[PDB]
Design a protein around this ligand. Structure first.
Ligand SMILES: Cc1c(Oc2ccccc2OCCn2ccc(=O)[nH]c2=O)cc(N(C)C(=O)CF)c2ccc(C#N)cc12
Lengths: 401, 547
């Protein structure tokens, strides 16, 4: 009911990001949505004196046919002054279950600072560049902006005060337009509790981190080894020696002495078996000196393994993985690599939000033009992470399979 | 007098920290001064400008060419940024045919849009006096001056706000703004169309804006931005290929401009060689001889540009189709159409700069470009016709290490067909010979060696001059491919060669990579295995090639 003064970082102008083309159906959907929002005073038309712009598009979330409006506030979030903070709940990832709730509508009841509204300008484009586009700016807290949860924070605490006082065993976290609620109850009790919370907020996505762990490096267990088996084992151990100091491969490479055929069976000497067992024991231990630094970026690398299987590693320093996983879920994308990749990026970003409270920078194994052409067709989250593109096939792919 | 509705003004500011212009007025001749005095007196009588006192410290030079012309370049430098008047040029293929298309001249509205009162003081200008024996006449603008930074955008937004209710309550017509001209198309009867045109002139008159009762000068065929627009078709303005004995750089840039421009409707235009001649020249007057490939290309262009070709307009009730053909040397051509033999438009795509490539990646890139262009022009992705078998695409994307995707498409049997030229095995080959390869070079003398040893005792080491480590690693693999049968296993420690080959190219800058590709094509089964170097892996002979 009262506006808080918001400014930009010193020396930075507002965002001036080009709007990318949209299909006719998304344009019509955004026309309906923005007309309704204009009727509700949430947005207002602007004149040509506003040179700022932030891209906009439309999606369809899970289990819903209604179109939704997404704004790519990445540039504005960068250029928006730093708001202050709350330490990240280290117990949210340890909880048995976590549920994600969309609380974006609550942001629209709080007005936006007068002098800052011009920086939230966005354009509905026209087909074939008929017009310069329908231009709008926000009057309330917009979904996707980083200042919206920071400003609404006090109100959110006031709304969640009775529920948090009633259940001290439930952990509540907030990120952008999402509320993460972690507990240890039964799925039915968790769903009834989630309905209790949603009706609690009314009058004012099953996720199980406990079924997630870090993945160790495993070596094959064979009774007979071929030259190729031993060559790949030596390669994988040589790679792992960058992560684990004591990995030793000289006794196994000793078997590869001579120019033998790749499919020839080679028996392991006792020195080789002992070296292999020592390597197994070393690989059973965690990595030495692996810590998280909140002042650094999180890097997420993804490898396509085929047959709908994908691997990923989250780290900050090379060979110091903070998280590793394998997303192989099949959700109506059996024939579309890019859709699988986009869902993978969304899931990894969600995990990263739960663990560290911020998104990572992705290294995507896809050409820039393909990804930038199709990723918005399968996006369903309210946030958007940063990403770069890997053009050279990494050798370590199979070492994560 | 009928009360005119006032046009809302747009608040305009200067760039932060900057101040209004203060430029010295040039001395003018007596006749020029008299002309500007007459013109400015009339304009003041009409209300476009107003006289001001000496308190205004700002000034903008004035000229006469009569015709008054104000040089607002400084005020433009000092004026805030505005939203673009256009995010791109419309394309004729995106237009939807109309029974009637009328043009209305709204030029007299340009000086009828008021300027922000607080900003008018920055538009001050002075007419010098005769012999400079009196104070010059001081003026400032009350409306959007021609040449000022913000006039087109403010004019367009004002006109749009005025046209908004008329467009809303007449959905059976289409109104389009272009500069000081409106374009109203409709499929109604010619009488109803002219009637609603008169209604539009009325609605515009309710803001005092005047459209000429005279018939407009523009009439079919419309000439616009190098385009010819006809009642039922469109094309480019006549492209004529010059007949030159010798060609300079500006002649080749004019020719590649005419060919790139003509390529949007004329199918099969190629610009590879002619643009290749401009590589690293940076000299406009330099005369460059003409290769024979550019002669054959130019002759094909003159054959294609012989007789006129037209494009049709867009019909949303019909599907959108885009067909692609490979032309060679990284060139691709495509046609977008809805009915056979009647194209909406055509185009071409050249491969990006790269050291290694294959036809499938290039076709993918072309499909992405066509998809983006089609979403721009028509707001939907077309259905594709591609010269590649379904099984080929499935093998490719299933085995490709990157994620890739092409939208809905179908195979068209039009050679040349995009295919996969080789596929590496996933497991070692039983019964095939195993070639352990290696190559090495000296960094100073550039002397190196490349060779292999095999399980059957076959060996080879070849010395090489003026070489590098990477070249010797590739050369080793090439030697193994040369001297082996139809099925071969190859063991290397070169992360470089494995990085190249795992990208699956079929063409390359390096002739050595091309030779390796030609060897891989002739083979039946090739399994390429990598091992770490210098780890005592027998067979892998770094010492054999370091002698
Ligand atoms: C004739 C015209 C435009 O045409 C149409 C205007 C209104 C409705 C539909 C239309 O095209 C349908 C197809 N069509 C086309 C021609 C015909 O004779 N009959 C037809 O049915 C559109 C333009 N552009 C690109 C604009 O941006 C207008 F602001 C023009 C720009 C400059 C000039 C000139 N000098 C002419 C333009």
């Amino acid at each position: 009911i009262e506006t808080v003064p918001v400014k930009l970082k010193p020396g930075m102008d507002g965002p001036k990001v080009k709007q990318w083309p949209l299909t006719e159906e998304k344009i019509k959907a955004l026309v309906e949505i923005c007309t309704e929002m204009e009727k509700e005073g949430k947005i207002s038309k602007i004149g040509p004196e506003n040179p700022y712009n932030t891209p906009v598009f439309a999606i369809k979330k899970k289990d819903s046919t209604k179109w939704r409006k997404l704004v790519d506030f990445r540039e504005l979030n960068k250029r928006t002054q730093d708001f202050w903070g709350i330490p990240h709940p280290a117990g949210l990832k340890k909880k048995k279950s976590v549920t994600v709730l969309d609380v974006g509508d609550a942001y629209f009841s709080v007005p936006l600072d007068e002098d800052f509204r011009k920086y939230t300008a966005f354009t509905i484009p026209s087909i074939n560049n008929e017009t310069p586009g329908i231009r709008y700016q926000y009057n309330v807290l917009p979904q996707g902006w980083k200042g919206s949860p920071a400003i609404f924070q006090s109100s959110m605490t006031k709304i969640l005060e009775p529920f948090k006082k009633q259940n001290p065993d439930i952990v509540i976290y907030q990120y952008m337009d999402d509320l993460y609620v972690g507990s240890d109850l039964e799925i039915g009790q968790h769903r009834t509790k989630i309905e209790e919370l949603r009706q609690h907020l009314l009058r004012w996505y099953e996720l199980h981190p406990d079924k997630w762990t870090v993945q160790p490096i495993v070596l094959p267990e064979k009774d007979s080894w071929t030259v190729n088996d031993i060559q790949k084992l030596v390669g994988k151990l040589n790679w792992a020696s960058q992560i684990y100091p004591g990995i030793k491969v000289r006794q196994l490479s000793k078997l590869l002495r001579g120019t033998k055929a790749l499919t020839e069976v080679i028996p392991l000497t006792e020195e080789a078996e002992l070296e292999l067992a020592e390597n197994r024991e070393i690989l059973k231990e965690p990595v030495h000196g692996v810590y998280y630094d909140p002042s650094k970026d999180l890097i997420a690398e993804i490898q396509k393994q085929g047959q709908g299987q994908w691997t990923y590693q989250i780290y900050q320093e090379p060979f110091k993985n903070l998280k590793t996983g394998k997303y192989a879920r099949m959700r109506g994308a059996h024939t579309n690599d890019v859709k699988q990749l986009t869902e993978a990026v969304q899931k990894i970003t969600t995990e990263s939000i739960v663990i560290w409270g911020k998104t990572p920078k992705f290294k995507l194994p896809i050409q820039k033009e393909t990804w930038e052409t199709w990723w918005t067709e399968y996006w369903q989250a309210t946030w958007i992470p940063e990403w770069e593109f890997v053009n050279t096939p990494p050798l370590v792919k199979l070492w994560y399979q | 007098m009928v009360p005119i509705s006032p046009i809302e003004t747009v608040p305009v500011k200067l760039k932060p920290g900057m101040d209004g212009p203060k430029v010295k007025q040039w001395p003018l001749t007596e006749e020029k001064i008299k002309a500007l005095v007459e013109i400015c007196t009339e304009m003041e009588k009409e209300g476009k400008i107003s006289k001001i006192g000496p308190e205004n410290p700002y000034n903008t030079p004035v000229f006469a060419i009569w015709r008054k012309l104000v040089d607002f370049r400084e005020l433009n430098k000092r004026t805030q940024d505005f939203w673009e008047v256009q995010l791109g040029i419309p394309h004729p293929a995106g237009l939807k045919k109309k029974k009637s298309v009328t043009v209305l001249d709204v030029g007299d509205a340009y000086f009828s849009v008021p300027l922000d009162e607080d900003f008018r003081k920055y538009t001050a200008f002075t007419i010098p006096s005769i012999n400079n024996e009196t104070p010059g006449i001081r003026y400032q603008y009350n409306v959007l001056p021609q040449g000022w930074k913000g006039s087109p955008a403010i004019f367009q937004s004002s006109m749009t706000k005025i046209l908004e209710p008329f467009a809303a309550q007449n959905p059976d017509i289409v109104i389009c703004q272009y500069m000081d001209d409106l374009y109203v198309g409709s499929d109604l009867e010619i009488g109803q169309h002219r009637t609603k045109i008169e209604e539009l002139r009325q609605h515009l008159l309710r803001w005092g804006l005047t459209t000429p009762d005279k018939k407009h000068q523009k009439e079919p065929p419309f000439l616009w931005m190098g385009y010819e627009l006809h009642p039922d078709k469109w094309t480019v303005q006549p492209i004529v290929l010059p007949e030159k004995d010798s060609w300079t750089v500006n002649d080749i840039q004019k020719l590649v401009g005419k060919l790139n421009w003509a390529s949007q409707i004329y199918p099969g235009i190629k610009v590879r060689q002619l643009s290749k001649l401009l590589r690293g020249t940076k000299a406009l007057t330099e005369v460059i001889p003409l290769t024979e490939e550019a002669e054959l290309e130019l002759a094909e262009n003159r054959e294609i540009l012989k007789e006129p070709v037209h494009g049709v307009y867009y019909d949303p009730s019909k599907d959108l189709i885009a067909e692609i053909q490979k032309q060679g040397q990284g060139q691709w051509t495509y046609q977008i159409y809805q009915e056979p033999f009647k194209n909406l438009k055509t185009g071409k795509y050249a491969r990006m700069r790269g050291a290694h490539t294959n036809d499938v990646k290039q076709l993918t890139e072309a499909v992405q470009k066509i998809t983006t262009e089609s979403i721009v022009i028509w707001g939907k992705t077309p259905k594709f016709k591609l010269p590649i078998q379904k099984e080929t695409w499935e093998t490719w994307w299933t085995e490709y290490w990157q994620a890739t995707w092409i939208p809905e498409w179908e195979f068209v049997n039009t050679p040349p067909l995009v295919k996969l030229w080789y596929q590496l095995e996933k497991e070692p080959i039983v019964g095939a010979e195993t070639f352990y390869v290696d190559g090495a070079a000296n960094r100073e003398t550039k002397l190196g060696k490349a060779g292999y040893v095999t399980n059957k005792g076959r060996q080879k080491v070849v010395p090489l001059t003026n070489t590098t480590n990477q070249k010797t690693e590739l050369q080793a693999i090439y030697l193994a491919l040369q001297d082996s049968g139809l099925e071969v296993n190859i063991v290397t420690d070169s992360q470089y060669a494995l990085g190249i080959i795992q990208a699956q190219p079929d063409k390359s800058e390096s002739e050595l990579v091309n030779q390796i590709i030609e060897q891989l094509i002739k083979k039946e089964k090739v399994y390429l295995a990598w091992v770490p170097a210098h780890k005592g892996i027998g067979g892998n002979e770094q010492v054999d090639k370091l002698v």
